[PDB]
TrEMBL record:
GO CC terms, sorted: cell envelope
InterPro entries, alphabetized: Bact_solute-bd_prot1, SBP, SBP_1_CS
Listed name of the protein: Sugar ABC transporter, periplasmic sugar-binding protein
Organism per entry: Thermus thermophilus (strain ATCC 27634 / DSM 579 / HB8)
Domain of life from the UniProt record: Bacteria
């Protein structure tokens, strides 16, 4: 019996059920969420959370949009910072501390990101950082150190690619991969509060990827996740969400490494994109539903729940207390990758929290990166188009 079967049963015998719409399609993240919910439901007296899978995160936002039109929101959902900004336009969200959920010791990297007009509207739950995944076997084979700088990263990819006869830096042509290169070549999306997609650092970042493809050291992955493509051709590195850890581990036929991101200099690791989601609570939910939300959120923020979630998935523990939990400690003592993910979570950048950001990152920025990388569109012309489309979307 799967944990979602156990939850369906707990929920059947409950007098209040708080629905939690999420965007986990399976693997470790879906299992860890459900296991956490099973445990919460068991300590309650007929008060339950029902996790409802809505597809991926994009399917999730579309389902929540539909929910607003219909006037039937769930009690909780996962949200990106930009989803929070959008739901706040609708005034759809309960201030988190109005529930009496205590947030002291939540990492300010995550807590800052859920604060709008000084008010916290989300609980950091499943927060990821990009890390460098690598093939320790293939690097040892050719005597190539883990690269510490972007310069060493490009040299390693070129040297390994020539040795193995194939592009060893694997990347998705998407906003998430672009963010790593953009941020770490000095880029910033907002200039005096205006969204700029076509700055010289944008052009430089997209050019580096496109030159990578031409020169034969960067391999665009067009079909499924990087971890879904492992096994065809030599692989040295990717830059990818920490929540892909269990996916990399299950798929890898080689000894998997995790490192901090290459930076401009050895003085500091590069910045990683913060991804995954916060839990929000909808004004429309009943007093009783909101009360279960309140208890669920205190449970999810407990050191044990965060320790178990983070060690099962590769997400970043969102609390100082999680790091002092002995379950976390015992995982970290036998697996240094958990410390690597925490170390990398210190060098952490967000995309803009604009209501329209979801549409822009996929259908505009995402497209322009695909045009340059897959159709050999001029990097600057592809981003000049993106800038034009985003300004049309954002205008007035
Ligand atoms: N809607 C919307 N999505 C957004 C936004 N910002 C970023 N993202 C997407 O967040 C994903 C990273 O979030 P994360 O929770 O760190 O990782 C996910 C999965 O990515 C990852 N996974 C799943 C299957 C698999 O084979 N491998 C694997 O690594 O496991 C986790 C649960 O699904 C990226 C994925 C993307 O959709 O291509 C674009 C990115 C936004 O603002 N809105
Ligand atoms: Na999955």
């Amino acid at each position: 019996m799967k944990p979602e079967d156990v939850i369906k049963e707990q929920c059947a015998r409950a007098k209040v059920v708080a629905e939690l719409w999420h965007g986990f399609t399976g693997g470790a993240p879906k299992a860890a969420l459900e296991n956490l919910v099973v445990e919460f439901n068991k300590a309650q007296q007929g008060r339950c959370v029902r996790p409802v899978p809505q597809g991926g995160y994009r399917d999730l936002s579309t389902k929540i949009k539909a929910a607003f039109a219909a006037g039937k929101v769930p009690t909780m959902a996962q949200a990106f910072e930009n989803n929070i900004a959008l739901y706040l336009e609708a005034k759809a969200l309960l201030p988190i501390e109005s529930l009496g959920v205590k947030l002291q010791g939540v990492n300010l990297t995550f807590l800052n990101a859920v604060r709008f007009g000084g008010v916290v509207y989300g609980v950091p739950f499943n927060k990821s950082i990009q890390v460098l995944y690598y093939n320790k076997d293939l690097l040892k084979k050719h005597g190539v150190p883990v690269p510490a700088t972007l310069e060493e990263f490009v040299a390693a990819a070129k040297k390994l690619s020539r040795a193995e006869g194939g592009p060893v830096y694997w990347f998705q042509p998407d906003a998430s991969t672009f963010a790593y290169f953009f941020f770490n070549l000095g880029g910033s999306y907002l200039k005096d509060g205006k969204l700029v997609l076509n700055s010289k650092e944008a052009v430089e970042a997209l050019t580096l990827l496109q030159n990578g493809v031409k020169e034969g050291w960067a391999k665009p992955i067009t079909s499924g996740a990087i971890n879904q493509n492992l096994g065809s051709g030599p692989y040295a590195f990717s830059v990818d969400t920490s929540a892909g850890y269990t996916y990399y581990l299950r798929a890898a036929k080689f000894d998997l490494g995790v490192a901090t991101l290459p930076g401009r200099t050895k003085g500091q690791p590069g910045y990683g994109l913060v991804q995954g989601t916060n839990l929000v609570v909808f004004r429309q939910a009943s007093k009783e539903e909101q009360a279960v939300a309140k208890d669920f959120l205190e449970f999810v923020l407990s050191p044990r729940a965060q320790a178990v979630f983070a060690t099962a998935t590769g997400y970043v523990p969102v609390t100082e207390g999680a790091l002092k939990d002995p379950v976390y400690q015992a995982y970290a003592a036998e697996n240094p990758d958990y410390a690597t993910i925490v170390r990398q979570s210190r060098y952490a950048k967000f995309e803009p929290a604009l209501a329209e950001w979801e549409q822009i990152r996929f259908d505009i920025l995402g497209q322009a990166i695909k045009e340059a990388i897959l159709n050999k569109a001029d990097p600057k012309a592809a981003l000049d188009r993106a800038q034009k489309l985003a300004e049309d979307l954002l205008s007035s």
